[PDB]
Amino acid sequence: TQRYYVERPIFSHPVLQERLHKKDKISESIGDKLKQAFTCTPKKIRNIIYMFLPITKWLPAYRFKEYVLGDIVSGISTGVLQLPQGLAFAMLAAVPPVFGLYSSFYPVIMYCFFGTSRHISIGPFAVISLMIGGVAVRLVPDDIVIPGGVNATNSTEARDALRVKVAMSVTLLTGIIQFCLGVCRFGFVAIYLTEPLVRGFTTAAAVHVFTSMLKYLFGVKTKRYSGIFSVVYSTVAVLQNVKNLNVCSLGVGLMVFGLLLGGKEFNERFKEKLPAPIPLEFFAVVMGTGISAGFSLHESYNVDVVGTLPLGLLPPANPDTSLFHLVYVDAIAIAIVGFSVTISMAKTLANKHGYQVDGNQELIALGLCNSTGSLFQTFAISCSLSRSLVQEGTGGKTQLAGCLASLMILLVILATGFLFESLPQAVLSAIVIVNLKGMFMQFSDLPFFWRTSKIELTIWLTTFVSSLFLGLDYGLITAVIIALMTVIYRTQSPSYIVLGQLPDTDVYIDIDAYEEVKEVPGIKIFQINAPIYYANSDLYSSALKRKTGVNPAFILGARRKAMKKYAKEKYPPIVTKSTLPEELQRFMPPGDNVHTIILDFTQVNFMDSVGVKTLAGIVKEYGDVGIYVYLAGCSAQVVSDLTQNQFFENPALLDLLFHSIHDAVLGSQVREALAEQ
Amino acid sequence: TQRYYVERPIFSHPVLQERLHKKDKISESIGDKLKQAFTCTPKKIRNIIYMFLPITKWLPAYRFKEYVLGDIVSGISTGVLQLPQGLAFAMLAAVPPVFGLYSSFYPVIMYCFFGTSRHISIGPFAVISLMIGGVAVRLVPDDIVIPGGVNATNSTEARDALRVKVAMSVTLLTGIIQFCLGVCRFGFVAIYLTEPLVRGFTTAAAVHVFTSMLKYLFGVKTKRYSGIFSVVYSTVAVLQNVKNLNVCSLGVGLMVFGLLLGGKEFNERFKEKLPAPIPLEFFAVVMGTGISAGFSLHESYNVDVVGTLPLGLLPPANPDTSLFHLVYVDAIAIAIVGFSVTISMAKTLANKHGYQVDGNQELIALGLCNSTGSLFQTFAISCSLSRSLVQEGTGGKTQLAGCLASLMILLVILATGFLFESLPQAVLSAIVIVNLKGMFMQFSDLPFFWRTSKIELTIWLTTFVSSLFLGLDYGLITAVIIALMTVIYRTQSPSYIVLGQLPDTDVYIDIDAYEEVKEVPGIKIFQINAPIYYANSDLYSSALKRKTGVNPAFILGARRKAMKKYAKEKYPPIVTKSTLPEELQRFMPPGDNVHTIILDFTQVNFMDSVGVKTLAGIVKEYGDVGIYVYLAGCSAQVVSDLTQNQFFENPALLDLLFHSIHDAVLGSQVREALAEQ
């Protein structure tokens, strides 16, 4: 023994209390919890606008070389990546690309004006376009083209306009929902989602996008679904008509994918400055345009392309305020999923470097971005589908990177539409698939969790299967609920243990864990590694009698039958402990004379009324048997709420408390020794 | 100090491990977990049939006087109580009373043959008839009476038969569901419901029944509902047509209620043997029959009565096996609610005396009872609505009480129908209301929980409002989920505390709690009374920096700015702890030189990957600041899963563990003293 000598007396509970006194419990009384605002405090409003507008630190505090170069490179890279991504998302939405461009341009600006994140390429997300198509098919008629008077071979431009309008309304509704959420300071909801939730959910997103791209890789017009086996029905529909349909589409897709792999190899083997300091993909766009125009293989197979790209911009407009009635549940589900994914992405980036991000600010940012896009004839967007990860590699220090990006995209679209008016619906698909595989290759955590624990497997897999098959919103909600159920199970099946004693110490560990530990006569220890709420209550009593081996009802019956077999030849004026009625006869079973029971509570977080009742029953029962029970851990809450419940008649129950396990041990030893008379 | 002298050396973790060795970890390997059955073990099958058929202890082990008298008195009392209850439930079901009698008779018998409970009067439950009417109105047409050819003034006997058939099918489906549940050994679901759940849920049941009786107290034929404000819409419908409708009904109801109160007073003031050792109500039946027949006030107001009571019994029949398709969701909801209420009642009785009840046995009992009643042209039943409580007061020792009861009811119905063929639909209502007030008068736990805790209020009230307004099934499910949410909140907002030291002891308690406790220099203690799962994680770090006052980022910024202001005038070859870069300058803030941080984990039940990551971050961050961190409670699970996660490079991180808080205290003291060189 180098140190740690105590020589302190025995403290059960009352020794403490009589040795102690409460201090004051001073608190902030009524009306003193608001005496900060309601005046012209420049500090208060200054800090409020600081947390609302993070901009107030950017231009005043900016670099000259590193910031500029990082912003430029990151913005150009993100824009070149996301432009085909925007096109693909718009075509998935079955809207002309111009709306995708609007989403890529305006909300980026409203975010650069609003949002505390730094390294994130805010843009449209895929499943968003997925539910866009889901509405466009469910709430929007597909094969009912109302004759306006022209009856074109495809007069669906009116149906497309209806799609635009319904997306407009739903995006506005989602934006206002997000704004209302933000003004209520929701960060609690941000943390309820786990890390495996985010990871598996992104996996399901990737597989859904993969399915959609495979469908739109060849041009088979089938039904779109959003229900049970929705992706399954989509893929079987694609399969049932794939044969001898298009070969130019597959050929161009495979060749562009090979070009993309060659670029992967070129930028991955070496990291230089002259050709490209950043792995890009625009040369694929260049070659696709060249093949379509100069080589002119469109008519060589009569293959199709993106089509026409309306050149110009649009004035603002508001959605019609008489149609939101029926489109309510869809809108709210979309807002829920949009926030879930966005704030998830937000935290999963903010956790990275020496910077933190308050979600509520990002929530109001996204709410305003969606509402404004709706006003600006645009659909709502999300944090990222994979580009934000690209943004990470491109070191987008400040938010000016995304601003300059979106400005570059707007300049390109307005000053040019012809150079890319003729691109197929497969090159963008291959780009999307490249991004998907890039973002999924590391989605092989299954061994990590497998070596880690079962529960991570459970939560991962249930999220994956619920989000993939069922609706992304339904998958999300079920996944969150089942994560909470994982928590309750973890605290439902604890690890009951029976402690021993480390010789000549006050340490107590489970006997099954080691051989060096010993036991103490007449004494049993039962440690619980979980609280006792209503649910995790009675099975605790069962496990107690089980591991301890002392079934007190068995004791009573054995005493009764043994005496039968021998027979053939002043306010609570109550004792909280009986004695042994056995008159010391030779019909005793070979049961050890364990006399006292000790339950560790140092690992008990809280307690509750059902638990109070069951502990009272257990204690009274053992006392009736004539077996002592002692409780270790009389700290604050356990005693507080046990006293709150009608548990004590100021009895020796108080004496049954012990602050230390070993303190209880020695108290019991002393009690037994005194009992020796 | 009387005892408790230790003088034991310093044990962080490795001192333990090098001082210890694991024992064996022997387990039951593959194929040895089933070597009990698959042979002709008379013990195994004997005990199996014991737990399946509790009867094997009743006739062989029976008394001669006490059992007989208790069974007789309990059975007669329960039967006389439940017979009008059965009539009321049938009329609520809008079926002729004969079906209520079938429910009162057959399933009681199948239970007396199956079920380990002793003191319970198994019978029909009200809300069951409520959802019966709900189906009879929703899935069964109400005002569409198909002309069969006779076109009577009320040809609805065919519609009533349709009601009977649909109840028949749904009861069969619920019975088979319960049986399937039972064979899967469900006791987990039994405990997930709390005590306040049961109490508040019964309150809502009582108010619903009260509403129904008030409606059928005067004969206003309105619409029945099962949705939002269902009871509210029912009661407003009743109110909108109540005026000058019936006065004989209210008069007879009030007079019979006064008779019931007089009986209450007579049996409550004294407890004798000659007039009635048990408070009964049959004299109300006698007087109602006398008024209807001899006094003959029916035509005096042209008031109505129960009607005709078909005399006789019925042969068995099975439901049509081509209609269960559409009636699936309703059937499953009914089975869910039936088990919930029944097993709740079962536990709430089994907990009472020296007897325990395994629910799965009761689940298979109820499943077979429902299925058989369906086969025997009968609707399914439940444990009780209030009579079981009567059964308690009547000391129904064994299950023969209910058997003799149901036999008495069958004898009365078959040998007599005329003596009660003419009874109004108000006397039974008053009886039901008497039972309801009897069962609710003690449903004033609100002060009990209010003095107890907030959480009980939350759970009680949410159950009450969800079950009353929304559907009883929906109310149930929402109530259970919100109870689990109460658990997660309780472990989401812990009680962070900062421990001090009891002078010259190793005890450590919160400083805010008492004045006698002191502090230890350069040392801070942060105790958590809740685990660290994914959710309850980052706010923990926040509260740490908050209560401790040591914002390490603040420390870094302060050091940086202070030095700026001074300036104007081999495998993991890594240190897990930095030092102080401050060169001891007079620009230091007046911050205390607290050098080490100690986090109690003795109250930490478990850990998880998100928590692992956040602890790693916190530790690394403080080490970088140059502040030590030590962990108390290196018992089993925390170290186990921290090691499982990529946490240790076999570094001094192991040395950062401590089995005892005070052990960590002294270790830090020693480290600092050694640092003094």
Tokens (6 digits) for B654? 């192991």
- Beta bridge partners, A497, equal A527
How far apart are alpha carbons A382 and A125 in whole angstroms? Answer: 5
Q: Which is it for strands B523-527 and A657-658: parallel, antiparallel or unpaired?
A: unpaired
CB B182 within 8 A of CB B338: no
Are the beta carbons of A23 and B515 separated by less than 8 Å?
yes
Are the beta carbons of A537 and B505 separated by less than 8 Å?
no
How far apart are alpha carbons A383 and B412 in whole angstroms? Answer: 75
CA-based nearest residue to B514, from B528, B499, B526, B524: B499
Q: Tell me which DSSP letter residue B463 carries.
A: H
CB B400 within 8 A of CB B58: yes
The answer for B 434-473 residues in CB contact with A (under 8 A) is 449, 451-453, 455-456
- A262 to chain B, closest Cα gap in Å: 35
Tokens (6 digits) for B623? 């080490």
Question: What is the maximum alpha-carbon separation in chain B?
Answer: 116
Closest CB from B488, B516, B613 relative to A20: B516
The answer for A 138-177 residues in CB contact with B (under 8 A) is none
DSSP sequence for B282-339: HHHHHHHHHIIIII--HHHHT---------S----B---TTSTTTSSHHHHHHHHHHH
The amino acid present at A528, given as its one-letter code, is I
How far apart are alpha carbons A219 and B129 in whole angstroms? Answer: 56
- A474 to chain B, closest Cα gap in Å: 16
Q: Tell me which DSSP letter residue B418 carries.
A: G
Alpha carbon separation from A298 to A92, A294, B594 (Å, rounded): 22, 10, 74
- Beta bridge partners, A596, equal A523, A628
Q: Which residues of A are annotated as a binding site for salicylate?
A: 386
Are the beta carbons of B192 and A666 separated by less than 8 Å?
no
Alpha carbon separation from B291 to B248, B296, B390 (Å, rounded): 12, 6, 28
Decide if B27 touches A, using CB distance below 8 A.
no
- Give A-chain residues touching B494 at CB under 8 angstroms: 605
**Distance from the Cα of residue B642 to its chain's centroid:** 35
Q: What residue has token string 């159920």?
A: A485
CB A437 within 8 A of CB A260: no
DSSP sequence for B437-456: HHHHTT---HHHHHHH-HHH
Decide if A614 touches B, using CB distance below 8 A.
no
CA-based nearest residue to A529, from A495, A555, A575: A495
CB A386 within 8 A of CB A436: yes
How far apart are alpha carbons A236 and B214 in whole angstroms? Answer: 57
| Rg of the Cα atoms in chain A | 35
Residues contacting B673, CB < 8 A, separation 6+:
none
Closest CB from A5, A535, A602 relative to B6: A5
How far apart are alpha carbons B619 and B627 in whole angstroms? Answer: 9
CA-based nearest residue to B426, from B286, B241, B252: B252
DSSP sequence for B588-654: --S-----EEEEE-TT-----HHHHHHHHHHHHHHHHHT-EEEEE---SHHHHHHHHSTT-SS-TTG
Closest CB from B3, B514, B635 relative to A21: B514
| Helices then strands, each counted (H, E), chain A | 25, 4
CA-based nearest residue to A166, from A344, A363, A331, A386: A331
Handedness of CA B611, B616, B617, B618 (dihedral sign): positive
The answer for A 306-335 residues in CB contact with B (under 8 A) is none
Q: List the A657-658 sheet strands across, edge first.
A: A523-527, A596-600, A628-632, A657-658
How far apart are alpha carbons B221 and B245 in whole angstroms? Answer: 11
**Burial annotation A373-389 (CB, 10 A radius, 16+ → b, else e):** bbbbbbbbbbbbbbbbb
Q: What residue segments make up the domains of chain B, in order of their start? A: 59-145+155-489, 523-675
Q: Which residues of B are annotated as a binding site for salicylate?
A: 386
Residues contacting A155, CB < 8 A, separation 6+:
A145, A147, A148
Are the beta carbons of B483 and A19 separated by less than 8 Å?
no
CB B207 within 8 A of CB B130: no
- Beta bridge partners, A330, equal none
CB A496 within 8 A of CB A528: yes
How far apart are alpha carbons A253 and A425 in whole angstroms? Answer: 9
Phi and psi angles of residue B376, each rounded to the nearest 5 degrees, phi first: -90, 30
Helix, strand, or coil (residue A376): strand
CB B394 within 8 A of CB B136: no
Decide if A636 touches B, using CB distance below 8 A.
yes
CA-based nearest residue to B601, from B516, B540, B521: B540
- Beta bridge partners, B501, equal B518
State the first-to-last Cα distance of chain B, in angstroms, to the nearest integer: 36
- B352 to chain A, closest Cα gap in Å: 11
How far apart are alpha carbons A115 and A107 in whole angstroms? Answer: 11
Decide if A531 touches B, using CB distance below 8 A.
yes
- Give A-chain residues touching B509 at CB under 8 angstroms: 635-636
How far apart are alpha carbons B440 and B434 in whole angstroms? Answer: 10
- A9 to chain B, closest Cα gap in Å: 4
CB A133 within 8 A of CB A94: yes
Residues contacting B554, CB < 8 A, separation 6+:
none
Closest CB from B1, B529, B609 relative to A8: B1
Helix, strand, or coil (residue B149): coil
Phi and psi angles of residue B45, each rounded to the nearest 5 degrees, phi first: -65, -35
Are the beta carbons of A515 and B3 separated by less than 8 Å?
no
CB B561 within 8 A of CB B593: no
Q: Tell me which DSSP letter residue B499 carries.
A: B
**Distance from the Cα of residue A167 to its chain's centroid:** 27
- Beta bridge partners, A657, equal A631
Q: Tell me which DSSP letter residue A336 carries.
A: H
The amino acid present at B596, given as its one-letter code, is T
Phi and psi angles of residue B538, each rounded to the nearest 5 degrees, phi first: -75, -40
Q: Is A326 exposed, middle or buried (0-12, 13-18, 19+ CB in 10 A)?
A: exposed
How far apart are alpha carbons B276 and A381 in whole angstroms? Answer: 77
Are the beta carbons of B495 and A645 separated by less than 8 Å?
no
CB A92 within 8 A of CB A216: yes
Resolution in A: 4.6
Long-range contacts of residues A21-28, Cβ cutoff 8 Å, at least 24 apart: A21/B514, A21/B515, A21/B516, A22/B513, A22/B514, A23/B512, A23/B513, A23/B514, A23/B515
Handedness of CA A229, A178, A115, A372 (dihedral sign): positive
**Distance from the Cα of residue A339 to its chain's centroid:** 12
CB B178 within 8 A of CB B370: yes
CB B289 within 8 A of CB B422: yes
- Give B-chain residues touching A533 at CB under 8 angstroms: 487, 490
Q: CA-based angle B604:B609:B612, to the nearest 5?
A: 60
CA-based nearest residue to B532, from B567, B492, B560: B492
Alpha carbon separation from B166 to A557, B159, B314, B323, B375 (Å, rounded): 50, 10, 18, 9, 13
Q: CA-based angle A657:A662:A665, to the nearest 5?
A: 70
Residue of A nearest to B647 (CA): A452
Chain breaks of chain B after residues with C–N above 2.5 Å: 569
**Burial annotation A609-623 (CB, 10 A radius, 16+ → b, else e):** bbbbbbbbebbebbb
The answer for B 178-237 residues in CB contact with A (under 8 A) is 191-192, 194-196
Are the beta carbons of B636 and A497 separated by less than 8 Å?
yes
Handedness of CA B474, B475, B480, B486 (dihedral sign): positive
Q: CA-based angle B322:B327:B329, to the nearest 5?
A: 140
Phi and psi angles of residue A597, each rounded to the nearest 5 degrees, phi first: -130, 135
Q: Tell me which DSSP letter residue A655 carries.
A: G
CA-based nearest residue to B556, from B507, B591, B532: B591
CB A531 within 8 A of CB A491: yes
| Rg of the Cα atoms in chain B | 35
Are the beta carbons of B504 and A641 separated by less than 8 Å?
no
The answer for B 532-551 residues in CB contact with A (under 8 A) is 533-535, 537-539
How far apart are alpha carbons A121 and A76 in whole angstroms? Answer: 11
Are the beta carbons of B1 and A11 separated by less than 8 Å?
no
The answer for B 511-530 residues in CB contact with A (under 8 A) is 512-516, 529-530
**Distance from the Cα of residue A658 to its chain's centroid:** 40
**Distance from the Cα of residue A151 to its chain's centroid:** 49
CA-based nearest residue to B87, from B136, B34, B119, B123: B123
**Distance from the Cα of residue A196 to its chain's centroid:** 7
Are the beta carbons of B666 and A8 separated by less than 8 Å?
no
Residue of B nearest to A660 (CA): B507
Alpha carbon separation from B102 to A569, B135, B409, B432 (Å, rounded): 54, 20, 10, 19
Phi and psi angles of residue B511, each rounded to the nearest 5 degrees, phi first: -70, -40
Q: Tell me which DSSP letter residue A293 carries.
A: I
How far apart are alpha carbons B92 and B130 in whole angstroms? Answer: 7
Reported as type and span, the H/E element at residue A543 is helix A538-548
Tokens (6 digits) for A120? 């994130």
Alpha carbon separation from A577 to A360, A554, A629, B385 (Å, rounded): 57, 18, 9, 38
Residues contacting B139, CB < 8 A, separation 6+:
B166, B326, B327, B330
CA-based nearest residue to A576, from A611, A542, A618, A544: A618
The amino acid present at B5, given as its one-letter code, is Y
The hierarchical CATH code for the domain B523-675 is 3.30.750.24
Long-range contacts of residues A290-296, Cβ cutoff 8 Å, at least 24 apart: A291/A252, A292/A422, A292/A423, A292/A424, A293/A422
Decide if A635 touches B, using CB distance below 8 A.
yes
Tokens (6 digits) for A585? 């006869």
- A670 to chain B, closest Cα gap in Å: 9
**Burial annotation B166-190 (CB, 10 A radius, 16+ → b, else e):** bbbbbbbbbbbbbbebbeeebbebb
Residues contacting B500, CB < 8 A, separation 6+:
B508, B509, B510, B511, B514, B517, B518, B519, B520, B525
The answer for B 344-363 residues in CB contact with A (under 8 A) is 354
**Distance from the Cα of residue B200 to its chain's centroid:** 10
- A346 to chain B, closest Cα gap in Å: 15
Decide if A304 touches B, using CB distance below 8 A.
no
Q: Is A313 left (phi over 0), alpha (psi -120 to 50) or beta?
A: beta
Q: What residue has token string 């149930």?
A: B476
Are the beta carbons of A6 and B505 separated by less than 8 Å?
yes
- Give A-chain residues touching B538 at CB under 8 angstroms: 191
CA-based nearest residue to B288, from B328, B327, B248, B320: B248
DSSP sequence for B23-58: -------TT-SSTTSSS--HHHHHHHHHHH-GGGGT
How far apart are alpha carbons A212 and A433 in whole angstroms? Answer: 10
Helix, strand, or coil (residue A11): coil
Closest CB from A1, A22, A452 relative to B609: A452
Are the beta carbons of A636 and B490 separated by less than 8 Å?
no
Phi and psi angles of residue B286, each rounded to the nearest 5 degrees, phi first: -60, -50
- A20 to chain B, closest Cα gap in Å: 7
Residue spans of alpha helices (H) in B184-227 = 188-192, 195-215
How far apart are alpha carbons B608 and B611 in whole angstroms? Answer: 5
**Burial annotation B265-298 (CB, 10 A radius, 16+ → b, else e):** eebeeeeeeeeeebbbbbebbebbbebbeeeeeb
Experimental method: cryo-EM
C-beta neighbour count of A566 within 10 angstroms? 13
Alpha carbon separation from A362 to A112, A294, A357, A372, A390 (Å, rounded): 11, 46, 8, 15, 20
Establish, for the pair of chains A and B, how many residue pairs have beta carbons separated by less than 8 Å: 201
- Give A-chain residues touching B344 at CB under 8 angstroms: none
Q: What residue has token string 């609920």?
A: A481
Long-range contacts of residues B443-447, Cβ cutoff 8 Å, at least 24 apart: B443/B199, B443/B202, B443/B203, B443/B206, B445/B196, B445/B199
Q: What residue has token string 């996008």?
A: A209
How far apart are alpha carbons B419 and B83 in whole angstroms? Answer: 14
Q: CA-based angle A423:A429:A434, to the nearest 5?
A: 125
- Beta bridge partners, A395, equal none
How far apart are alpha carbons A350 and A337 in whole angstroms? Answer: 20
Tokens (6 digits) for B598? 């100690």
How far apart are alpha carbons A649 and A637 in whole angstroms? Answer: 19
How far apart are alpha carbons A260 and A520 in whole angstroms? Answer: 72
CA-based nearest residue to B3, from A499, A518, A11: A11
CB A497 within 8 A of CB A570: no
Tokens (6 digits) for B168? 């028949």
Phi and psi angles of residue A631, each rounded to the nearest 5 degrees, phi first: -115, 130
